[model samples]
Structure formats: structure tokens, C-alpha cells
Target: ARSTNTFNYATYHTLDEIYDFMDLLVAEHPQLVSKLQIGRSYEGRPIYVLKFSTGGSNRPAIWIDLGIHSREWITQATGVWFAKKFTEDYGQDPSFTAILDSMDIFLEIVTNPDGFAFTHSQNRLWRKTRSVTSSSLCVGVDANRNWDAGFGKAGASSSPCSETYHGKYANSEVEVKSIVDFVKDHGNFKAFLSIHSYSQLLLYPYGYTTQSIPDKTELNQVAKSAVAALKSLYGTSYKYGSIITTIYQASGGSIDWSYNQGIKYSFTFELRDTGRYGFLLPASQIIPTAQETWLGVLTIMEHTVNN
Candidate 1:
């Protein structure tokens, strides 16, 4: 199905475009949307967080992040789409309604602001922030693998040239540290999701290796059910795994980091089109992809009650 660029969708946007869109949303939907700066990137770019919640004195909370990788514009798209849906389609869109009614969701859209802006202005495939490293001529630490969990281990390369370069040290990137500090300071965050794209998979903790977390079975079972709900909508096929098993091994991923920090349910969704569109993923696929992913999120939220 093609996107109408109407409600339930926002046209495909660049990094600047996405930020501008968030500014407008925050201005209009002041109750449901707001902003916070976790910290600044190495290049001094303020890492702005866009929050979406029901706005009240009492509510359970969960945190979601998107746009860790600079080139993957879909991550930002998904974040904005979720924000719009949750704010406008709340009671009308059943699943989101329940989530909004009960859960105080914090949608932290665009975590790595510097990296995202750099990708759009410079390299369309840029994956990390503008952090200078002594590794090679062009060195950018893989922010996904720059987390403290499974730090400096397998599925990550010490070489700066590799796409999976872990970093000079754990939590080396200011961007990663900013995210960690925000979660730590916030306190009541129940679940966490760090969104990415082009892989078409919903992955849970233990991306650093194949071994599962203490909550392994429970996480996998919940994720399996969620993916099933998404597939029911468009018959879309998304491989669900523990990062190492279904995809590849990766150390220091955000999902694992958030889980280790005590957030029970942590997941990373690599959004639509396995490789047909690669990073570009035409505007045509935006709506259906967002709808399918939204269903998956709703299914999970429905079952995920405070324990």
C-alpha cells in the first residue's frame, strides 16, 4: 500500500526535516510532546529527546529511542510516526489507546543527533557521531556497539575501520553516555526499545553473544508473540532472534545495555525491506511499514503490564 502523506503517516524526512517536524509537534501538542537534552555529542551537538506521554501526575512509564544510526532515516521516521499516532489516534487506534491510557511512554526520538546530521549533510551511510579517533583516517565508533554491556567483546571489532567497531573504550562516545545517564536519572523506565532499520528483525538482549540473559525465555516469548501480531497485519516476514543467533553477534548493543540497567523488556527493531530498498526504502513503503510495526508494539504493550 502506498502512503498518502496523511494522518497515520508523515512524509519521508531528512534529519533536519525530522527535527523541524518534532519542533512543530511539541509546539502544538504541548501536553503529549516535549523535549529534553540528555547531553551533547563530542562535536557539541545537543542530543535532543522528544518525549510523548499522556501528561499527568500519575502513570507507569516506558522509554523508546530511535535514530542511533545516522544513515537509517527510517528509525527517525518510525519514531515520529509513533509519536503522531499515539497523540492523535490514541482512543481511536485501540492498541495505542490502551498504551496511552495506562502507560506513560517516553519516545526519545533521535539519540545520536550529531551522527544523524552528519550522515545527511556528508555521507549518506554515516553510522557514528563525529567523534575523532586515532584508529584510521575515517574513524567513527559504532554507537550501537559502544554501550557498556558486553563491552569490548565478540561481534565487535577493535579496528576503527570495521562497521562494528566497538570504540576506544566502553561508553566511549558521549552520545552513548548521555543515553545511559538519562535512563539512570529518570529511574522509573519499565521497558526500553532502541530502533534501527534495513534488517527486518525484532531482536532482544544478548546481541554481544549467543548466550541469553537471565530473562531470556520470557523476553523471547514476548517478542515472538509481538512479531506474530505484526505479521498478521501485512503477512510481513521478520526474523526474531537474540541478535547473535538470527542475525550476527554484536557487542555493546543498546537493547542489552538497557536491560542490564534494569529495564525488563528491551528490544531493537530493524525496520522494513530487508535489502530491496537498502537504506533508501522509498516513501511508498512508509505507511504500511509503520502500521505493521505499530501493531507489533501494541501487541507487546497489551501483554506487558507492570509486574
Candidate 2:
């Protein structure tokens, strides 16, 4: 389980490889490992959460959510790989060791399991669940755009045919509802990390529109430092700002949703290159990307725990 990071997962790893990766990690580290079958997807795929540091049950918890969009394979890879890294680091790396000893790290590798599988098998760019709506022939809903905050009232689309279409109803997709329910039950989250890719930026709430959250000043400070930590390793430019101000206006997203849940320390990380392969970030960059991302996340955790 402590293999080198030379494995470039840039090319799509089959769905089995993805699931096996989780199985292997948990099998190897049973004490610090346990899997939660939060719920099943529409197609009946078991959506799971890998929990680390069972002994640290009293410690403040942090949540890492990935693979909300099936087409974004990088996010799924990062989620499972990060989970492996978490287990590996909990014992070997001093920094992660400290955090593992003091925190419950809950990693949800695929929030939209049915959509993810569909992307892998049918359409490589399927961004939403395979749920059907009677309003139109449109076949999916942007679960990210389907959250209750602002709902279809903001940057999201009400038209079922739109790519950014919010679902006919909030939490209509079972996959999204499962994630929302998970967040609701685990209110002790110290920080919420929703990982996505290709944007080359780190973002925080209020992305649905121009209005900033009440903690705008402090949130900006946290984000700037996080970007600085990312820069120290690769020296690459990472645009750090409010979600809407930095990138396109996005509503019903997990970052903004986490804020509404009172988990103020929320972030959506867009990992890797800004163009070219886009969602298909080459496997060769996986190690460096993971290393840099882990660094940024560790820095944020350290700063947040102390604050």
C-alpha cells in the first residue's frame, strides 16, 4: 500500500481499478480503516466513504468529497489516491500523522457513483447523473447545480436540457441527496474539501453570485495562504479568490452548500492543468499534482486547527 507515486493515473483507470484501489487500501490498514456504505446510486452502485483514524473519534473531522461529475475522472482518482495517501501518511509522515492522530478524515471518493460509471462506460464527458426528467428529453441534472442554496435561481439553468441544469427538484438525484444527507449528519466537519479539476484554481463559497459570505475577509486570508502553500512546491500560478469572483458564477455547489451547513472552512479544489486534456489530466502529473495538493491541504489544516 506504500508504493511509490510513479503510477500515473492520467489515462482513465477502469471503474474496477478505482473500486479495487479502495478495497486494497482498506484491507491493508484495517485499524485505521473502515468503509461506510452511505447509500446506493440510481443504478445501484454502492457509494462508499472511506473513514480514517477510528481511534481519533473525538478529534475534529474533515471531509474530502470528490467525483461529483462522472466526466471528471481526475477528481475520482485524486479522491481514492488521497485516501490511500491518508492511510499511508497517518503512520509514516509526521505532518499527516499529527492530523490523523487528531482528526477523523472522511473521504467520499465518488459522490455521483451512477454518473461516474456511466461516464466511464457510455460517455466520457457525462457531467451529471443519468436521471430522466419528464419535462424534457434531457437525461441528466447537474447535481452540483441542484442544491437548495439559490437552486435554479442563480448561475444554474432551469431548462432540463442545459448542461448546468438544476434538477427538477432540489436533491432530486439520489446521489446528491445521499451526499447532502451525509453532510447533514456529520456536522462536526472542521473543513470541507470538494475536489474537482482542470480549472487550476482553489475556490470558496459565494460562487453562485457576487455577494460574499460573512466571513469573506477571513476566508480570503485562508485561501491566499493555501495558494501560497501550493506555489511553494511548483511555483505555478494558482488563482485564489471567491468562487464567483475568481471563476464563473456557480450555485448549488458543494462549497457553497458546505457554507450553508455552517462548515465555514469549505473549499473546492480544481486540481491540475488548465487546458489540453482538461478532465483527462495525464497520469504522469498525478504524483506531482497529488504532492502539491496534499501540501496545500496540510497547510490549510494546520492553519485551521491552530486558529
Candidate 3:
């Protein structure tokens, strides 16, 4: 059956609920939205992505995925709200309408479905994929660190049990590999945005290296403008810079991988509260967090189209 409370954006949802919402969205907006099964998780749950387009083939696209780290519930929550917002604002909001007119958007609300399920049913703090290893008892790898960029480098852990483990090899996790393959096969994405939580940061590429991107100046400026637009919504301040400089030297991060692949506007957003609530951000803050995040994301998309 279809979900009964599809409009309840202010609360958190189970994996099934969010997955059902995806169908509800496509059913409601059949003209503009459709669902794609990208791949399956370690536990065999399908990894789904919602595609929002206005009749375009191979059009420049925006790639946004949330919940790579299951504990960061806010990203997935905001993603669900974001899906709804796209349908609501496309025609009503001039700027958004302009975006959909030219570009397609691929949004993956649960990048780590097995881990996400674990977070809900067994552990509230799980931060990795639920893939198992024959070498050890540890059951998962940090999906963010399983990307191809600078794999097994500094910021990632080599041990299987570490929270930041980079995995047996880059793109070893099927969840991360599915996205890598999809985006690379499409080969026309203009921006790649990965949403996470608790740091309130908008960061650019070169997380795995000290060297600067050739387009650093333009990307930094875009980050600044996006942060400004986000703050205007509710006065939430955000720090913007390169990932290595702003947060740490994280190897195998998705943004870094995307940037290296020529997607110049790659960014990772660490959303809401500095640390007051951390991963357990109150459900009450869902709408406000998503509201501001939408502004920031929209700001980036606007830049993508204009440039």
C-alpha cells in the first residue's frame, strides 16, 4: 500500500517508509519523475534513485546522495523533504522551474540501505555499509572512504573495524560502486553533492591531496555564495573551504572522486547543529534544516547553470 502520511516531512522515517515515498513521488509526478534501481545492497535491498527531469536525454545533471553514513539521519531526512520540494516548487518557484527546464537531478536518499536499516533496528550510531569481510569479524566498510579517489590514503583507516575504513579496495562496496558506475556511464553530470550532518560545512575538492584544483577560485566563490543564501533562510552559519583544509585530509571521499573525474562543482555538505545534538538531531528541526539546505543546494545549482 502507499504511505498514508506522505506529507509528513517534519519527522524521521524508516527505510521502507522512505522507499515507499519514492514511489509515491513518481506516482504523483509521473510527468517529471521516475525511479531507477541502481544496484543492490549487501543484504540484498535495492538501492534506488529518484530521477527528476523535464524531458531531456543526456542533459547535464546534478547528483545528490544522502545517508552514506547511516547515523547521520539528518541527510536522509532532508533528502526526503528535498524530493517533495522538487515537485512542489518546480512550477511555483521561478528559479527551480528554470533548473528543471534544462537539467536532470538524480537523488539517492539511502546510499547504504543495509547500514541504514541497522541504524534503525539495531544500532543508532552505525556509520558504514553492511558488507562483510572474510578476513575479520567486522561487518562493514565506511562507504564514503570506499570511493576511488586516493583510496587507502591518509584520512581513511586501513583496519576493517575502524569507522573510517577505506575497504579492501576502492569502490569495493557495491553501493558506492553502483553510483560510481552510474555517474561515469552517464558522463554528463555537472555537479555532485553528497549530504552528511553535524558539522555545518560546505566543502569543495582535494580532500585526499594538498594540491589545489585548477578551478579552486571559482568553486570557492560558489561555496561562499551558497553559504550566504543558506544563512539568509534561518541564520544558520556555515564554513566553506576545501575538505582537507576545512575538516581534514580525507581520502576516498565522494566529492574528491567526482572532482577528479571532471565534475568541477563537487561538494559535500555537513548539515545542521555544530555538536549540540550531533547525529541525533531532533526531528523538530527537520523542516528548518531542509529549508536552509535547499537554499544552499539551489544556490549551487543556479551557479552550475549560469556557468
Candidate 4:
């Protein structure tokens, strides 16, 4: 059967449109994909994750979450393209086929549903979960900074109104906690990749502190190879390093939390355009970005399956 969604990949979409696309993909490729409702958002909208598996129960998996910051539309858009590409590539691309045969992939295109909807409706640049603070009028917490790794640290803010606010406590936001609980319960995730935008970087753990991860050498080499593969496709160069050294001292970050939980191939991709367009990346670049980004992600996956 053909897919019900004929939406163009070259444009951004609303929350309903993207959510509907997930069901369409599962309907079209029933054997390869299923939509899982992990939890409800602060606004009570369902938080969906598309799980791609080939006859397995609790198999070793690759975890990918995009749009945690909400305004980073490119990551969510790229995630939509990735869903379709996975259906098209597997059984045709030998490498992807091999990887899928043995492992599962869990992709959450809109990790922050409330904020993502807020980005489309209320504000075009909102970057946090839409949960109201207890006393103040400020609404929302930075989901990325709400993880358990380094809560309330220097890199994040304590004020609820701040853009990088880490929330009152670790895993405070339901959006962040959903992924954390899901991944922890599964307990077999080999690689955890969090997708973000506007910086063109592939980073590893220890964003909370200057101390390097014990697996720094191996993860650095993996990042090097992935970035090289990404560059080969479109010549879009990406810097690779530890999060703190390469980007900033970002505490309570998702990848950092995942690494601490024992996922060795943990990474965060700051995708495309450096700062030319920032979070308002044009829709025209969507396909090209997803195309190239796919190579980088696949490089990591190949390594995960082999090593």
C-alpha cells in the first residue's frame, strides 16, 4: 500500500501533520515500524516515538531524539525524512539492512510536543517544555538541561524564565523524564544520539564537567569518521569534540546522562548552516541536510553494530 502522507519533505509541518505522518509510516511499513506513545506532554498531548524493529524483544537499540529544544525545526524535519529513508533504504542498502536485521531504532521526532506546538503557534522561537513554574509566571523548562547528569550546574540557569533553565530538579520535565525512564527500563541501548541544530558539530559526553569521558578516544575517533562521512556527501564540514570543549559547558544534557547510564556510543549532533540561518533554517535545505546527516548517523550505527 502507498503512504497516506504525500507531504513534501521540503517544508515544515505542524504538530498534527508530523504526528499523522508517523502513523502513515507505520501503516505503510508495518513490519519495520510501530508508533509508541511513551508519555503525555505537559499540555496532555501524546508524546510519540517511532520504533523500528525486525522481530525482536528488547533488542540492542539506537536511540535518536530530535526537537528537544522545539525551535530547532531542522532536527525534527530531518527526522521525518529519516523515517521515510529508513523504509526505502533497508533491504536495498546492504549496510542499513544488516544493521536493522540485528538491532532496533527508536526515534522521537518531536521530543517536546508542547514546546514544538508552541513554536508553531504561540512563538516561532520557543525552546522549552510548556510546563508552568510553581510561583512565577514564566512557563517552560529547557528539556535538554532538565536531565539528571549535571542538574543546576554552571552551564544552565536556575531562573525559570531563562532560556537554558535547568528546571527545579533533575528529570523534572515530563518530556525529559519520559526518555530517561524509557531508556533506563529498556537497558540495552548501545548508542544514544540527540539531534539539535545550527552549530555543525558532533559531540561526545562530559558537557557537565571538564573531566573527559573514559571512552573519549574511541568516541572521538567515531565522531571523526562520522563527520568525514557527512562531509563526503555535500562538503558541509562539522567540528567534532567533547561537548564542553567544542560547544559550551552544557550541564544536565541528554547525551551526558545517557553516557552515565552506560551507553557508549552517545553523541549529540548540532546540525547544519553554522550560524548563517540559525534555528530558522530554510525549508529548501531540508533534503540536502537530511541526506548528508544520514551518512553521519549511519557511520555511527555501523560502528555500533560492529563494535
lDDT of each structure?
0.79, 0.79, 0.93, 0.92
- True-structure RMSD for candidate 1: 3.1
lDDT pick, better of 1 and 3: 3
The estimated TM-scores of all candidates read: 0.91, 0.93, 0.98, 0.98
lDDT per residue for candidate 2 within 206-247, as digits (tens), equals 777688799888878888888888888887668888888888
Candidate 1 runs further than 4 Å off: 1-10, 56-59
When summed lDDT is taken over every stretch of 10 residues in candidate 1, the lowest stretch is: 1-10
Q: Looking at candidate 3, what is the lDDT of residue 190?
A: 97
Worst 10 residues of 4 by lDDT: 1-10
* Candidate 3 error regions (>4 Å): 1-6
Residue 200 of model 3, lDDT score: 96
Report the backbone clash tally of model 1: 0
Better of 2 and 3 by lDDT: 3
Where does candidate 4 stray beyond 4 Å? 1-5
Worst 10 residues of 2 by lDDT: 1-10
Error of 1 at 151 (Å): 0.5
Expressed as tens digits, the lDDT of each residue in 1-307 for candidate 1 is 1221343354566656666666777777787778777788787777787766776654567778888887888777778788777767866877667677777877777878887877767788888767775547866888998998889888888888777788898989998898788788778778887788887899887777666688888888888898898999889988897888878778888888888888888888889888988888877788788889888887667767635
Query: In model 3, what is the error at residue 94, expressed in angstroms?
Result: 0.8
Off by over 4 Å in 2: 1-11, 54-58
Instruction: Return the clash pairs for model 1, or none.
Output: none
